[PDB]
Structure formats: structure tokens, C-alpha cells
Design a protein around this ligand. Sequence first.
Ligand SMILES: CS(=O)(=O)c1ccc(C(O)=C2C(=O)CCCC2=O)c([N+](=O)[O-])c1
Ligand SMILES: CS(=O)(=O)c1ccc(C(O)=C2C(=O)CCCC2=O)c([N+](=O)[O-])c1
Ligand SMILES: [Co+2]
Ligand SMILES: [Co+2]
Lengths: 366, 369
Amino acid sequence: FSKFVRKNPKSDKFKVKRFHHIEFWCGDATNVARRFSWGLGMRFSAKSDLSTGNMVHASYLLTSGDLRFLFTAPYSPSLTASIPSFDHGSCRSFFSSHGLGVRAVAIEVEDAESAFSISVANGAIPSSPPIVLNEAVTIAEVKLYGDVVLRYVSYKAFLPGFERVEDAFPLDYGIRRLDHAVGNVPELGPALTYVAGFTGFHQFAEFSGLNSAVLASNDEMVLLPINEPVKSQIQTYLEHNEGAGLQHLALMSEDIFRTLREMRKRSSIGGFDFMPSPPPTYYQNLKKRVGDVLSDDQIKECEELGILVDRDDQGTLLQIFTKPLGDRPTIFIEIIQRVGCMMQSGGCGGFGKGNFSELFKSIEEY
Amino acid sequence: FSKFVRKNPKSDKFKVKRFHHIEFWCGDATNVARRFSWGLGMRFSAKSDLSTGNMVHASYLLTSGDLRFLFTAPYSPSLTASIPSFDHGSCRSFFSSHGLGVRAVAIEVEDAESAFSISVANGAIPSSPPIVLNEAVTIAEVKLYGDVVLRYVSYKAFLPGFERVDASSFPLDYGIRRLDHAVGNVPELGPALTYVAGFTGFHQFAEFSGLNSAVLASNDEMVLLPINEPVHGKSQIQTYLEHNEGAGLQHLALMSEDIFRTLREMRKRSSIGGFDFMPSPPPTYYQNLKKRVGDVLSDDQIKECEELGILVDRDDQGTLLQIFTKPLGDRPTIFIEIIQRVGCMMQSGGCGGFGKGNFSELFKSIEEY
Ligand SMILES: CS(=O)(=O)c1ccc(C(O)=C2C(=O)CCCC2=O)c([N+](=O)[O-])c1
Ligand SMILES: CS(=O)(=O)c1ccc(C(O)=C2C(=O)CCCC2=O)c([N+](=O)[O-])c1
Ligand SMILES: [Co+2]
Ligand SMILES: [Co+2]
């Protein structure tokens, strides 16, 4: 009776691959990284600070699976830098106006020199030219939205100037990669026009107080949703963050029950807090909608963990959200596990849009 | 046939009680407060942030016994505040230029209204005049060294504005009970002691590498404030001074009712968010312990020091267990000291000293072969 048809022109203007890393910018990178390390279960595995010769910034790298979080903070200008786009004047201005937040959204491409030239010839505002690192890595950044940039990394074979680390049954709760990354802007329209203009990402098709549109690369493994405000928590983000900027990171986990039992045990001891949980009638209503996909016990396991379930035409998406990460109510994190389109299709299950109404309906029915 | 003689003129110019709290100025206090809380074993007790109506700064207060560690970072000017000494321009420049560190070292007093008037009269530079909060508490701040301020907290009989924190069954506790002392790094010791002692009346508490130290003390000798200058000809005092961009607080000793229970808990967490300690002394260091502190510790308590990297020193009055963490933030500046003092029971302040005999004991032990 029902059918949902999707288009994919594959209009990528240059060839991209995968999410590479995210770069948090902060004031003291050691504590943000040691916090996030115990909350998310990410192994400290590369660094570039004083003990490595870097007298410009302290950059630490947390890895879990392929997911790579880089934490960067400036030292005193009175004092070698491995990241060629770093600057005290821009980093101090970033953190003053926005607080703890994502500075770069980084994606592996075939060639960063071309990826940047084609971008800038297609409307992209440049933020950092192509710089070859030790004849091994190329790095370039164009403005994405607000003071967030889209960062192109390319190889010929973490980064030059980084040392390795391995010592900590090390930290691993099941997080395996970055699924999608989300910004908020004032006016979605011009933002979609800009971004899709210089990348050729096609709009992804989905099944209160925001309007959402999702860009995807040719393989739809580089997903970028964007939200505009229609009270509206999108509007609250823009005020506290002082402009456009990134809203959440969704982390793909190989077992969302493993990940969640770990991250809820640590909420009150340095880890991360979560949204208050749906009413029990939300989970009583699961069997009627996804009981062909989740066994009763896994349904039990979602109620026991506050885990949201939605599905669209292809598969089913399990998701739960944290509270804000630092001071301001701005950046939160989303933990997701996608089930269904096994080949795994990018975006299997969508992004959770269905849960707004399905959560309202569960509230009303006791 | 030796005796160490201590004088105590008890020259306090006002009446001071104990250490009250330490305030770290941050950029994002949530991750620092949470890092410290898991790392030291201190409970979340109060807040003053957006959730409670404060829209100028976020402050999260961690306690553990009597130790009170307050964490404050500024919001955006575009947005209620419970600490009348705060400033966005002051907190930005404090964090741009010194990194994460101590802003204020706060002491309880009979009257902060009078502690300030006397201090300013004897040289001390005023930083925040006395301000009564909800007609219940009074707060004032005079410049200590660099951008540290000495802060006076007097009661009529955590603070006004703070919402008390929620429960998690048996919250964190590794044994830390109070702030023993709060050490400073100055370029010149002389002008340091003259200025501080000139306005506090605190007296030189006598002691039994590349630095010179003098310990300043109130009439009960329970508020302790050692001060350090560098000796040139390398010096960690001088290395502090460059990364900190001037004078500032160098370390906090955290008294613990069982240093082993604290170092067992803390060392378990070093690589899962916690704190890291300096490399442990050679094993000859501890073979030497029997003959200098065997009359105070057992054979099993000298083993527990080795299995833990703990250092032992003693005075004419008592013995001093101590261990040191690596620098708590990005910059190589402020660190934390975990100590527990044995003896001087009536417990006195400055039982066992401050560890100054451990420079040569460590160096002596290092000559293994
Ligand atoms: C109302 S809810 O089910 O809790 C809920 C459900 C889904 C999301 C989701 O992350 C967002 C997507 O990434 C991109 C499109 C908009 C959107 O909604 C959120 N959200 O993070 O705002 C909340
Ligand atoms: C030789 S040692 O064991 O490393 C060692 C032993 C004692 C201390 C001690 O806490 C300090 C005192 O409180 C004040 C005097 C200066 C000083 O040295 C430290 N320290 O400055 O970290 C190191
Ligand atoms: Co999402
Ligand atoms: Co000390």
C-alpha cells in the first residue's frame, strides 16, 4: 500500500570518503579530554603538546573504533604547531564567543588540494589554504556555518607531529564511528544553498520547533543535518552559542545497550547525563510498531535505558541523547545504532524525526 | 643531644580560623569539576549556574570532608551572580594568560569587614571590598601574589545563591579531609614575605634544590602558606614562572585520613580520567625507611608506601607521608599534594614539616649504582 522513493543524483563535485575526525576547541584540553575519555570510553592514543615539542597548543586525540576526537587548546603566546590552521587570536575568540564546541568537521577525501579548489570555485568561503604536512597529509578548511569549518584531509599512503600513546583492559564501551554531525543556523534556506552549492551533496529524504534538511555525500556515509528554528530550543542554542554552530554529534555504536549501561553508570562520576526518560506507555507501545525487529527482551532493555526507537521505510534506528557537554546548553551528543539495510546503508532508519510525535502520544496516554 | 627551638609571637593582626575553599577559574567548569570529582573523590554539593538563575558565571562546588574546591567559568556577556568579586573581563584575561589555576585562597575569619580594613592599612592591595551577601555572609579580597587574591569569608552565625545538589547513593570519597597548605611561586621571596606578612601578621614557621622557601602561618598555625622563589644556576620555580606568566599558586596539599586509601583510589583512576603522579622513588629509597621512620611505621606500612610511591619525612615533632601529582592542566604549573601527618596529638599544624628533607633523601637514594 505504501512506498517511499528516494533520489540520489550523486552530484558530489569532488570525491569524498569518510568522516575523519572532529576537532573540539577548548580552553583546557587536558580536562575536556580526560572527562570525555571516561564518559564516552575513548582511548588516549596520540598527542602533540609540550612533551612533544609543540609550544603552541595542546592537542590530544581520543579514539574509539574509527571515531576520532581531537581536543585542542592554546598555550601562552609568550612561548612547532602540528595543526597548520591553529591561531591564538582565532582560538581565543572562538572559545570566548562560543565556549566548549566543535571547531572543525573533518572528512577524508581523495585529494584536498582539488577538494578545496572546487569548493572555493563553487561558493565556499575559504578558511585555510591547502598545506602539505611532511609530504604525507594535505589539510584545507572552508567555512561551513558560523565559526565551524569543513576540513579536507587527504593521504598518499594520526597526523605528522603527533606522538603515539598506549598504556591503559583499555577504555571501550562500543562506540565505533561518527554517524552524522549537525549544525544549527538562523535561516536553513541560505545555509542549504551555500553548503550544497560548493559540495554537490544531495538532500536526504525523511519519512515542532525546527525545520531540518540533511545533506549526504554520494555514498550517504557523510551525513550533515542542519536545523533552523520555527521556546524553540534551536533559538536557545543560537543565543548561548552566539551564532551559527554545531548542535550534536551522533556516535554509531556496535551495541547501544552496552554503550548505554556503561555511560549511565558513569553519569554521576565524571561521565555524561541523559534526557529524562519516556513514560512507560512509550515502551508498551513499542511491540505494535517495531516488535518485528526487536525481541521483547531488547524492548525491555530499551525501557531500562531510556532508549528511543524509530523506523522508516528501510530500517530501524535506536537512539538516546545526553545533556549539554559543557556550561552552555549547546552541544549535546547522540548515541545511535542502526538496524536493517544490511549489505550497511548510510542513514538506515533515518534520524529520529518520527519520535517527536510518538513521544507526545505516549505522554498523553498516561 | 639536639633540640629544635620554635618561636611563635602569635602576631595575627586579625582573627583567622581555618581554610574555607579554593576557587579555580576555568573556561568550561563542568568538565574540570567533573574531572576533579572522579579524580580526587569529592562530591558535587552546590551549584551556581543557569539552572539556578545565575547567568554571569557557572560555579560548581566540590567538597570532601572540609576541603571545598570551587570551579568558575564566565558565560557570554550577552545574557544573577552569587560571587560579587566576579568579572567577565577579569576572568577572560586570567584564563588567557595563566591557564587553569587558583584565583583565590579563602580563609574563615571572625569578621571579613575588619580583616580587610586591617590588611589594607598594612600595605595589602585591595582587590574586592567587603560585600554582605543576603545579610548573612561577608566576603572580601586583597591581592596575595600575582593574580591570586586572599579572600575573607566571615559568618554572622555553601554560599547565598547556591542551590544544594540530588544524591547518588554512596557518593565519592577517597579519604581527602581538608586543605593542609597552599604554596606560592614568587620571583623574589623577600618582597613576597614582606608584603604578605606585612598585612596578615603571619609568622615564620621554622623548617627542620633550585629554590628558597619560607612558610607563613597564623596564630594556631592551621592556615599554612609556604612561599617559593627560584634559585638560578633548570629551576621548576623558574619553569612555573614562564608557563604561568608570573606569580601564582603552585600546589595544594590535601590532607587525607588514610593516604593509602586515597592513593589506592587515586592511582586506580590515573588513566581513566583521573590524575597522574611523579615517577616513584628507587627501591633503595624505601629500604632506607626502616632506619629513619621504623619507630613510627610498621614493616607493612613501609611496604604500602613502596607499592604506592609515597614519600616519608619527619621533623622534631612528627612524621609526614606525602606524594605529588603531575600538573593538573594543560600548562605545567599547578599540581596537587596528597599528605597525611602522624604525631603531634593534643593534631598540630605543620606536624612532620613540609618535606624539605626529601630533596636530599631522594637524591641520596637515587645513587643506587
Ligand atoms: C524529539 S527527539 O526524539 O528526542 C529527537 C529526535 C531526533 C533528533 C535528531 O538528532 C535530529 C537529526 O539528527 C537531524 C534532523 C532533525 C532532528 O531531530 C533530535 N535531536 O538531536 O534534536 C531529537
Ligand atoms: C624533593 S620532593 O619530594 O619532590 C618535594 C618535597 C616537598 C615539597 C613541598 O611540598 C614544598 C613545600 O610544601 C614548601 C617548601 C617548598 C617545597 O618543596 C615538594 N614540592 O614542592 O612539590 C617536593
Ligand atoms: Co541526530
Ligand atoms: Co607541599
